[PDB]
Design a protein around this ligand. Sequence first.
Ligand SMILES: Nc1ncnc2c1ncn2[C@@H]1O[C@H](COP(=O)(O)O)[C@@H](O)[C@H]1O
Ligand SMILES: Nc1ncnc2c1ncn2[C@@H]1O[C@H](COP(=O)(O)O)[C@@H](O)[C@H]1O
Ligand SMILES: [Mg+2]
Ligand SMILES: [Mg+2]
Lengths: 362, 362
Amino acid sequence: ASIIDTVANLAKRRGFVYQSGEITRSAWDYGPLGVELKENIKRQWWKSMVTAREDVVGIDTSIILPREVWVASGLHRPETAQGIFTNFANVVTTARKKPPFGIAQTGKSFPGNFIFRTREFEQMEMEFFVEPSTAKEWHQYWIDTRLQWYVDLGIDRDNLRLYEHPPEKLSHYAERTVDIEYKYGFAGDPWGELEGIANRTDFDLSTHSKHSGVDLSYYDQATDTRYVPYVIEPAAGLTRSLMAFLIDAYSEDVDKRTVLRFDPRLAPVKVAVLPLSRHADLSPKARDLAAELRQHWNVEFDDAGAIGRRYRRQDEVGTPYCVTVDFDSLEDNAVTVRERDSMAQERISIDQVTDYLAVRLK
Amino acid sequence: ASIIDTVANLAKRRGFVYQSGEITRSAWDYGPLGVELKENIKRQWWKSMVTAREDVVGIDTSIILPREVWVASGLHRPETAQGIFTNFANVVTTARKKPPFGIAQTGKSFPGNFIFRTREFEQMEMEFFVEPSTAKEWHQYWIDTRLQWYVDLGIDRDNLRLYEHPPEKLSHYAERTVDIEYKYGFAGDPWGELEGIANRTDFDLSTHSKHSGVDLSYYDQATDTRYVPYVIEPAAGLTRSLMAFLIDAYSEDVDKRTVLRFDPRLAPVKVAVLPLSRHADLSPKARDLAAELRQHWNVEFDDAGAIGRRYRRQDEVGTPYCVTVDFDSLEDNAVTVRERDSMAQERISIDQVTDYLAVRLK
Ligand SMILES: Nc1ncnc2c1ncn2[C@@H]1O[C@H](COP(=O)(O)O)[C@@H](O)[C@H]1O
Ligand SMILES: Nc1ncnc2c1ncn2[C@@H]1O[C@H](COP(=O)(O)O)[C@@H](O)[C@H]1O
Ligand SMILES: [Mg+2]
Ligand SMILES: [Mg+2]
């Protein structure tokens, strides 16, 4: 069985995903784990792009926009970029930004290969407006940065690549386009697109200024000049990003153990509290610690079955850490922290546990 | 001018909101500040409902669901609840949950009063399934809890109220319904709905089990019994929640100062770094500190104009704290922290600033 089918079956079994209305079929709902993973991915993207950057701001435009907007690109989005292009001047005005600077957005746009190609999906797109003569430079920068982003979130570099669009497959408005591709594992060609980084020149603002009559050019006072900025567009797939991170984290460990090697910042469940048994003495302290940890992270409490099977489930979903409360805990007031990948166990005082986990959960 | 019009004008001026495609009109895009505020509200709701609760899990269902789903409630959502009702059993299975327990979701569903009534909006809904004989109890609980939630995020209690639906205005499937209403400030009746907490009995699961043929009843082993759980539905408006928080935070301060008294956890911009002047010596250290803070929170750097006007803008948008870097900072290596509401200023060492802010930013 292909890796893709295996990962999809695992996702369905552990509630990462459910067939949308099990009772299109390419429409998928995200179960608890799936929702948490998707949100973690979105938050990391937003933090790397918006909150961490002085030159990039955020925006959230309506799915249903005026019909003339898409005539330019009582009847009434296939992408999230046109809202950004239309609110360019509004952002320049309120946020007090000048090129080079970015406007970032995430949102839903409207088959097979599991969730690779779905009718309803979510995109994470940024429009970086720059003075034309720097576009190329900036383009490379982003091409690099975006790529490393995935690596920085745990994707094996060897499963990522850059595909340069040849002049024939380049759009008339696109001067250069470099797509990040991931080795999903499809039949035939196993590589697929994940995020497209395009140099759209000044086509978008020019077109919207012509069709709207509003001058969307920027005026640089430093030089007393006026120009239509060039646009660098990193457009990443949220559904495809989740698919890629999930696929890459999958691993089978002589003994065999299934484990999702999620980067901590992306795991749906950060910590699992596991009383050695259902004993009346262990469970209360365990639930107390679990409540303390829920004050910070999404936690799971499981007192069911042997400790080994519970460890197996928590690794199967990629939980970074497990906290075991044994009978010695009732005496020394310490718990056993088990790190997912290495399975290394270390006994630490309960009143420090949180900090011990914080540093490690990034 | 009504408070509502004033707040809307302020929102448009400072980039909380833009008229969707300025170039329906009741469709609104969220500018940078607006996006950050909306996301903060969503995150607090999710933390209070999902991550902090052992008995509540999350889910994210597709906007476009099978047509029979809405026949029960190639042509193809007005609410986000039907996905939850359809995935009840899937969640019981993957998450290993038993009544009483909740399934929470947030998502877009599809005029005037600014953003109070918009065609495309976002809801935050939770379905709490419980053994029937406890519904009433639980209902009250949630009715209380939800209410306090708003108060805990800074809304003056006196602008919130509970409206009991009389038997005539109760739906056939609803046994009791208590709507939280906020004093928005409309013409005529200034109160409007904000979140509805309904007791839907076992209508939803019964209807979906009849129309789908799949038995969605729960089996309690502790008693060896089988029953259709009763549903408690807190359904809050994300657009209306933002409108309410924004309206309530607005204040005019003898001298007059406009200020948004946002709870820290909801302010779009948590901190503003303000060099006393554009001097070449102050700006570098200021940008260094600003980068350090962007590692944690959304920050704004403003070296434009007099320090007073910059303080005025940062209060006008509700920024909790301002960090001023003066020439003495170059000597003592300390900065002046100005707390929004009180305007109290305290000089603190730079290498501690972050912690000083952390404790206060909750
Ligand atoms: N049908 C789809 N399902 C899931 N993700 C998609 C789909 N179409 C596009 N994407 C993602 O959205 C990104 C930007 O789309 P585009 O602007 O059309 O290149 C792509 O690089 C994909 O990661
Ligand atoms: N047209 C709308 N615009 C903005 N928010 C809405 C709209 N309709 C409903 N809501 C919010 O969604 C919540 C749940 O909707 P409902 O399930 O229809 O009662 C309401 O309590 C409102 O806060
Ligand atoms: Mg920023
Ligand atoms: Mg939870």
